[PDB]
Amino acid sequence: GNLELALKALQILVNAAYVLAEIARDRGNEELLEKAARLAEEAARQAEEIARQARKEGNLELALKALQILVNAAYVLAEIARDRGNEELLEKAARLAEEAARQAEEIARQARKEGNLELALKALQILVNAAYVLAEIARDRGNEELLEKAARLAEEAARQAEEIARQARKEGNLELALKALQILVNAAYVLAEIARDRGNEELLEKAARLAEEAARQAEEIARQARKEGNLELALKALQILVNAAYVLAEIARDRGNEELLEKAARLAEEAARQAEEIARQARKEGNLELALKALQILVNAAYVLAEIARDRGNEELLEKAARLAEEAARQAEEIARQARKEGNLELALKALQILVNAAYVLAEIARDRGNEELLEKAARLAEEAARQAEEIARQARKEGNLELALKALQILVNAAYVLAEIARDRGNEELLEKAARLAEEAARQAEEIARQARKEGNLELALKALQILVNAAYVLAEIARDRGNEELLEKAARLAEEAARQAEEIARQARKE
């Protein structure tokens, strides 16, 4: 009776259904769409059963993980339904999302009574996630009543998160305060998305106040944590500053406010400058994991700046974003190299992941600029990561370290995704086919590892392998997308149905246990 392991399997089931739904749409295959809906519905049916058992036993953490699957299932059912006019599916999706929101609010109440503020914020994140799914459904159906309910759910989450941040400060617990600020940012993003259903100016202004409230406090918390020498805390705060700036840019973009656009960009640049200084300090002290966390903020800040620059081809911001991403790529390469010399292969893989993420941001900038050399530089970064990933995977499997191997295969899938996107940017069939083969190799090794894991009875390991299958199948679907590649869509559908079927078997065994 391993409920945590069963839920992990069901999340894989939802993720596979989501991928099959995307493949079914690209190919107009109504039968495949029906199959994806049943998988998503079956995942939600079992998750809702597990939610009930978890709460009966008082395991609120497990119950929240079950509610998240309800929400993800609802999202998948709404994505399937909106193309056609499938009101019966949208109603099921709304029912699931509303049930998740209700239970989330009940658990937030109970968590706060018992003084468990971290649990309460996890309940509020589910509340925000359910509000997001409801907002999409309500926008599809032109149901203003339900849009109003989604907005009220997001606002309730932000209101409670504001209260918990104040309690957290009073207990000196700034880490917890930051988790509350992240709820504010996520709630603000949902409200702005709801307000973008034509001129709800009062909702947009509410969303902007929330995001600005989080930015202001994240910036001050980062400054103080850094002055007190608490670098790990400062970076968490800088991530929230970047996330707040992203939402402010979306609000600014929508409301045509060039002033707010510029403010959002300054916040993102300030976060990147602080992260750059923290990375240099962390490497001076020899703290490579810290340093890599700083570099990912550089990439995230650069991604925000490039998005801000999108519409109007802003020359300063695009070149600023380019230098930030290249800075992170170079330092990640250096750290990967040192980590591999010191035999620290997990650290090396984290560095390659930052390299892939930097390369993705550079490819976006190169694309918008028609910059051939930067596109080529981005592809070389992605190809460097993929090559090092398969070397680490090969050695990991040789020594029987399957978890390490799977982490390396995930890097390979991510690098293939970046290379696929560059291949789109050049209209190059050859590069596109090379990216697909990188993804196919990763999927092939992941299937064999899943088989070896299950033969040994290691179901936790096998589920991690199945997730790579899902992610690989998603990359293959993105490559065949808008190209009419029937051969590739079939390989993608095959991988996602493989993961789905094995996830179902593992869920069943975990529930017996």
- The DSSP string of 395-439 is HHHHTT-HHHHHHHHHHHHHHHHHHHHHHHHHT-HHHHHHHHHHH
Tokens of 96: 């699931």
To the nearest 10 degrees (0 to 180), the angle between helices 117-141 and 144-170 is: 160
Other Cβ atoms less than 10 A from the Cβ of 142: the count is 9
503/11 Cα distance (integer angstroms): 9
Structure tokens at 43: 């995942």
Task: Name the token pair of 351.
Answer: 């560095």
* DSSP letter (8 states) at residue 23: H
Q: What is the rounded CA–CA span in Å between residue 485 and residue 471?
A: 18
Nearest to 96 by CA among 58, 69, 70: 70
What distance in Å separates the CA atoms of residue 355 and residue 348, rounded to the nearest whole number?
11
Write out the DSSP string of 41-87: HHHHHHHHHHHHHHHHTT-HHHHHHHHHHHHHHHHHHHHHHHHTT-H
Among 492, 472, 437, 459, which residue's Cα sits nearest to residue 451?
459
Reference 162, options 177, 174, 151; nearest CA is: 177
DSSP class of residue 367 equals H
Among 173, 72, 74, which Cα is nearest to 470's?
72
What are φ and ψ of residue 86, in 5° steps? -85, 85
Nearest to 38 by CA among 77, 88, 79, 96: 77
Angle (deg, nearest 10), helices 402-426 and 429-455: 160
Amino acid letter for position 228: E
The type of residue at 379 is A
Residue 32, H or E segment: helix 30-56
Q: HSE-up of 491 (CA within 13 Å, CB side)?
A: 18
In 3D space, the residue among 11, 26, 132 whose CA is nearest the CA of residue 65 turns out to be: 11
Say how far apart CA 336 and CA 349 lie, in whole Å. Answer: 7
Both ends of the chain: CA-CA distance in Å? Answer: 3
H-type helices in 57-173, by residue range?
60-83, 87-113, 117-141, 144-170
DSSP codes, 427-493: T-HHHHHHHHHHHHHHHHHHHHHHHHHHHTT-HHHHHHHHHHHHHHHHHHHHHSTTTT-HHHHHHHH
Q: Tell me 268's DSSP state.
A: H
Nominal resolution (angstroms): 2.1
- Can you read off the two tokens belonging to residue 136? 């999409």
How many distinct helices (H) and strands (E) make up the chain?
A: 18, 0
Shortest CA distance to 500 belongs to which of 70, 114, 42, 48?
Answer: 42
Rounded CA-CA distance 418/412 in Å is 10
Annotate 31-47 with b (16+ C-beta within 10 A) or e (fewer): ebbebbbebbbbbbebb
CA 476 – CA 439 distance, rounded (Å): 7
Asked if 324 and 302 touch (Cβ cutoff 8 Å), the reply is yes
Q: Is the dihedral of CA 223, 228, 234, 240 positive or negative?
A: negative
**Distance between CA atoms of residues 206 and 211, nearest Å:** 9
Amino acid at 264: A
After which residues are there C–N gaps above 2.5 Å in the chain? none
Q: Measured between alpha carbons, how far is 468 from 88 in angstroms, rounded to an integer? A: 32
Residues whose CB is less than 8 angstroms from the CB of residue 261 and which lie 6 or more positions away in sequence, other chains included = 249, 252, 253, 308
